[PDB]
């Protein structure tokens, strides 16, 4: 919200969107770039966010700012985009920051799930797959995931 002499955040919606398989294969691993848009399923709805509310572009991944005792990371934007001032209006601004992080993953017996260093649980066996009977390993997710 833009007051006469001040700007105030009415709200800041923060979300983590997965990078689809096709973008990981065709953009990140192939060129080291990410799409500036995030298209993903959230709350049973297909939602699309455009970085800076601008047209889709390929954005280069760059090393993240170094931190001690921290694994390797890459991202595309380090600035949050906020709408330009228009007085006496509520305005919205979208920021999309594509992040790639190498992480440690840990799994305890019977290895039907594992965790990431970020605290995120993955409810699937590390040894899940299609070969050598690994398709009988635990998966909580649908096949298309």
């Amino acid at each position, epitope marked *: 919200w833009f007051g006469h002499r001040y700007s105030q955040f009415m709200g800041i919606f923060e979300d983590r969107a997965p990078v689809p*398989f*096709e973008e990981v*294969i065709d953009k990140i691993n192939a060129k080291g770039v990410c799409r500036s848009t995030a298209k993903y399923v959230r709350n049973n709805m297909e939602t699309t966010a455009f970085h800076r509310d601008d047209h889709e572009t390929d954005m280069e991944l760059k090393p993240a700012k170094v931190a001690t005792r921290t694994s390797r990371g890459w991202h595309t934007t380090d600035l949050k985009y906020n709408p330009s001032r228009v007085e006496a209006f509520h305005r919205y601004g979208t920021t999309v920051n594509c992040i790639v992080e190498e992480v440690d993953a840990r799994s305890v017996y019977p290895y039907d799930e594992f965790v990431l260093a970020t605290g995120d649980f993955v409810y699937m066996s590390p040894f899940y797959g*299609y*070969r050598e*009977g690994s*398709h009988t390993e635990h998966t909580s997710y649908a*096949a*298309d995931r």
Partner: nanobody
Amino acid sequence: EVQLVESGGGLVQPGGSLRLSCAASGVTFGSNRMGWFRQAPGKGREFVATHSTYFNPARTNYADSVKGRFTISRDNAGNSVYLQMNSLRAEDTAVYYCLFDRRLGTVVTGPEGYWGQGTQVTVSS
């Protein structure tokens, strides 16, 4: 663990049409690549076509010789791949092999993939 059953080959006169089918059973429930390779007499097994459900819409690839004449598709619900060949020239005489594979790309295969027994296709004037 995948079983592959081919069908639909045989004798063709040049300019004819032939539709090979390959049904896949077993552990086939994820995204995968199903395609056709061929082995000509005294020649290596070379890429012909592939149909990949790793992408939506599915990605089809063809060898240079067969583009525009050969079409690869899949049935609904997947697990069966069809190669419709039109305008079969004399170069098409080979044993065609059906491939089910968890890879991308066109030509590179591996021992982990599953090959069919092979269907003979002869094109003689």
